[model samples]
Target chain A: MRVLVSNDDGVDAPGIKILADALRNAGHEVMVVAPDRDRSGASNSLTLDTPIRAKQIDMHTYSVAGTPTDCVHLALTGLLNYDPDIVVSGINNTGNLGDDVIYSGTVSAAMEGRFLGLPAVAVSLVTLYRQQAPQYETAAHAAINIVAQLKTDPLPADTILNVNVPDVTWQQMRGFKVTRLGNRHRSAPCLTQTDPRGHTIYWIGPAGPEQDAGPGTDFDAVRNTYISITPIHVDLTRYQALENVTRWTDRLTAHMD
Target chain B: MRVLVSNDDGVDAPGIKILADALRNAGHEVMVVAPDRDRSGASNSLTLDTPIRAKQIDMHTYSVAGTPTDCVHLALTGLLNYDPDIVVSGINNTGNLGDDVIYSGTVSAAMEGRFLGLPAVAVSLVTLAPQYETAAHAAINIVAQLKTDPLPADTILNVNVPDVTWQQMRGFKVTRLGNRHRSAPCLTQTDPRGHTIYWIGPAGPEQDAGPGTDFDAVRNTYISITPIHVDLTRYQALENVTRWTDRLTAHM
Candidate 1:
């Protein structure tokens, strides 16, 4: 399989490196196209206002001076000589659970691939504590297994998988579970401060604690040491609310003189 | 209603100015919090790594050096003294139809508001040559009506108005988001310094712009209002994926 590997943690991050190496060792042709710097929380941003530069770092790797979405977009739209069979993002250093997916570049990268019509998966190593070494091998194995399965039995075209692997040895890994996203509470408030020149500034704070981490959710599955695979799609229309919105639009537009 | 108005276009952009003036003339207390510069294609990005500054341009307007999402998050989370009942983003110079919603700062601002427990709407003036006042009129009508008879609090509306006068408008239409083909190839050029650079090209032509889609609604001069949700989970495909997972496990 020809694989396009990317990450929000830049082209040199350990997780992406391990994943790319593992795929190569497995006899798959691999290409690494990722941000030149960490672009965490970049979401699906594209570098529209300015021109982006993609510099080749190695025989099969290119470091792009843009977001993760930019890397994959460039790869699929023009940069690559051939179309990849799939796009595999991350082995992210941390989890992209719940509301985290809304602002996750890892997930966004995979979403871009799916948008361009390909099988995609975003793998994250759910590291619970700071300074703890991430179990990149565990996530790498999960990605390999999932990618293999996708080749034989592809899921729907619009569907991309979000895989969260517990930061444990692969031998200790529990089985996989299909799950839904469970959101967290609102983020912790911004950290307010005054700079040295007497200017006020606010640093965005960490994400809030889990509020919907119950069973059958991505958060719960990862918490119990299982690989959680949640299918994500790009169509954000609230279909269930369409009829109600139609009714509300009538009342709202009726008063227009 | 106390409304907070923001946009991907900076605070001083003409579209937002028209929207702010329109909402103000309608007798609503509107606070303007938006990025200091154009942040188009900013998606739902957050400025997590660096500290951002918010400069107060007026008693009710603050321009933040951040993404559209950051501006709304700051407003709702700490900057403002009182909570706004609703958030209204954009009278954007361009449309946010179909897959455009995925990478729109205008819609992202409204999504941030919805995430923080407020009713929100993102309005766009769909045109190559924009008539922002047309969208402003539509926004005023929707916001005013929403105040009197609101939908569910979590419902976030993405509204695209044709670039026509309010009198010329054919009423509102509830539509599903359409789809677009993959974007065209990036355009490469050589900069003055001889570095090759690539500009993300125009969005692909519409692939699913049939009737009952936002693209069709706006084309017929109707104000298209598509209700959007925050959950990216593909609920309809979950069962099929589960079955596939079973097959994978059976082999392992």
Candidate 2:
């Protein structure tokens, strides 16, 4: 199996190397293309205005000076010569649960692959601050398992999987649950202060708590120490709203004329 | 309408100023919160590791040293005194047609608004170079009409006014996003210092430019409008993937 591994936490991050090594040891042809630095919240961003630079770290591993999306985009187009069977984008440092996927570079990297017609998976280990980070053996095995399934059952063209696993070994797992991307209340206000030059400085403190971590959600599955697998689509059209909006288009012309 | 206006092109860009003025002249209470400089391609990003600064330009406008998403996030959270009735994010210099919305700071600013449950619109002018005159009037009209005709709460509309004269216009077309069949994905060159530099090349020269698409509408002298949603789960795959997940027992 040909697998391309990438992440938002930069090439030097331990989780990426762990996942890469684990996949190679499992006998899959593995490639790694990732950001040179942490680009956590860079969602589906492409570095258009600037030039991207890549440094080949080793065989089949290159670090790109761009967003997670840029890494995946260039990997498939410019970096690699072979087409990967699947693009696996994480073993991220933290979880990409719920609305976190919206601002997540990890998820967006996989999304870039999905847009380009590759089966992709964005995986992460749910770890809280001050809690012990898992070794990622469980996450890697889950990725391997999913890729094995994909060899026969091809995913829908417009979809990618968002996987979140708890900070536990596979032996301690509660299995995988198919889930949806959950919603949350908007995060709190930016923390304000004065800079040295007497200007207003602000920091986005932390995201708000789960307002809708209902049943069969990624958040819920991760809470129960289970692997959550969600099939996310690239097309963000609200089909139901399109129907409602169609009714307003005639008046739109009337108001315009 | 208490309209909150923001943009990826920053506070000083003419497109943003034109939009603010258009909305203001249309009798809406307008406030501007924007990135201090151009934040093009800064998609739904949040500044977590760094502290951002803002210079209060005046009573109505404030410039933040952050991305477009940060501007809207900060405005809704810390900057604005009151909740805005609607959030209008652009009049972006170039068209955010098709999957361009995926990487657009313009569209993501409105996505931030939609995340917070505000009625939002991201507007752009489909132009080869920097042309704003024709589209601004159309954008202003479209905005005014939408404000009176309010779109559904479940979606955020991405509006692109074709750069055409009012006389030649073929009215507005409600369309869905069309994916880009990207060409020349990237170009590589060696700098004088021997560093390999790669530029993300232009996406199209356009395919899939057919009916009921943003590109199709723009080409036909119609204003292209698409309502975007954030929940991107492919409904058809839900049951199938669930069935697959059901098969993965303790082996998973």
Candidate 3:
């Protein structure tokens, strides 16, 4: 099967290498198109202001100077020139569990694929420290296994599969679980500091400790050394708000008229 | 009501002034907090590696050295101190229709507010040249109405109110529209200095250009107000896909 692999952790990140290699060894045609640099926190962003340039490293691997979203856009629209059977994004360096998906470039790349009407999956390693890196191959194996099993099974048009693997060896890992998006308590107060030139700046506070990460959550599954797969989508329409907004707008229109 | 007003247009834009004035005139305690410059298309982005600073222009007016999302974040977490009764964003200089919301700094501000658990709304003038005075007056009127009857929790979290004169606006039409047609054609070429440069790509190609879409409603001169929700789940397809998965799993 033709597989398009991309990630947010840049082209040279170890996670991407492990993922691409595993997918390649499995005998699938792997095309590696990823960002040239880390675009970790870029959520669903596309590069429009600049003409994105792609540097081909090999026949199969290319790096784009853009966000993960941009890489996928370029690959689908510019590089591949033909639709692949499935799009796989990441073996992201960090886990994209919980509310953190809103800021994940890894998931966003997969989101772009789903947006383009392709069956897609985003995979990540659940680890906090790079030194204590988990075996990404386990997650890769899970992803390959899932893809192989579901090659003909189509996911919902609006949904993209988000997979998170624990930072443990294969034997210690629990089996895969279908899960829901979990919540992470809000981070502490944002860090405020001054630049060397005395210009004030800000940095995000560390992620708050996990809260409400009970069973059947991506967070819990990762903690139990299992791969967590959740479906995510882009339609943010709150239907229940329809009547309220309609009423509100109706009243305002009358008052204004 | 203590209302924090912001927009993607820079602080000096006429749109903000009109909105601030109308909100204040409507007797709401209004605080104007906006970006230092126009941050159009800056979606729900946050400046994580930089310290954001807010400078008070006067009582009830502040400016942030960041995007609309930054302004809302600072106003809620730092400036207001107390949670606002409601957060109103925009009277944006341009429309944020259809999928444009995905890249809009204006809507992102309100999305940030919703993300923070506040009832928020983002309004925009659907005009090629937005008439700030008329749009702001319409927005203020909407805000007053909202005060009397607030939106339902989890309702269309984002509202795109089109720009038609108070008289010509054929009232409000609640509609679910497909994406907009791209008017601004994307220009692709190599720059004189030998680098590739592509201008702002054309708007989305027309998937469906029929009535009831945000595009059609606005084009027909009706107030094309769409209720946008945040959860992107396509629930209807769940059962269909599950059956497919079940079949595939069994075969495997």
Each model's lDDT comes to 0.79, 0.76, 0.68
Q: Give lDDT: candidate 3, residue A93.
A: 66
Q: Which pairs, if any, clash in model 2?
A: none
Query: Residue B186 of candidate 3: its Cα lDDT?
Result: 41
Candidate 3 wrongly placed segments (more than 4 Å): A40-50, A130-134, A185-216, A239-256, B41-51, B161-164, B180-206, B232-252
Please list the residue runs of candidate 2 whose C-alpha ends up more than 4 Å from where it truly belongs after superposition: A41-44, A47-57, A63-65, A78-80, A130-133, A185-210, B41-43, B129-133, B183-206, B250-252
- For candidate 2, write residues A176-225 as lDDT tens digits: 67878777648566687887888767888765664678786777778787
Q: DockQ of each candidate's interface versus the true one?
A: 0.57, 0.59, 0.38
lDDT of 2 by residue, B1-252 (tens): 688888887789988887777767778898888888775644455767789878788889888888887788888876667778888887787778766666677877787788888878788887754556666676566667766666557777788877666677777777887866555466889898998899877756756667787787778788777877777655567788777776666342
Question: What docking class should model 3 receive?
Answer: acceptable
**lDDT string, candidate 1, B1-252, tens digits:** 788888888888988888888888989898898888876644465666688998989888898888888888888777779777888888788778877677677787888777778888888877755677777766777777776786877667888878777678777688998875576687889999998999888756746778888888888888787878777877888879888888888884
Best by TM-score: 2
The 10-residue segment of model 2 chain B with minimum total lDDT is B38-47
lDDT of 3 by residue, B1-252 (tens): 888788878889887788777777878787788888876644355676656776778877787788777777766654566657788887776776666566567777777777667777777876665566766665666666666676654543444555555666566687774653323334557867987644446555546557766777777777666677554444455556545545544653
- Model 2 Cα shift for residue B20 (angstroms): 1.9
How far out, in Å, is residue A216 in model 3?
4.1
Cα-based lDDT at residue B45, candidate 2: 54
Candidate 2's displacement at residue B9, Å, is 1.0
TM-score of chain A of each: 0.87, 0.86, 0.85
Instruction: At residue B187, give the lDDT of candidate 3.
Output: 53
Please give the C-alpha DockQ score of model 3: 0.38
Candidate closer to the true structure by DockQ (higher is better), 2 or 3: 2
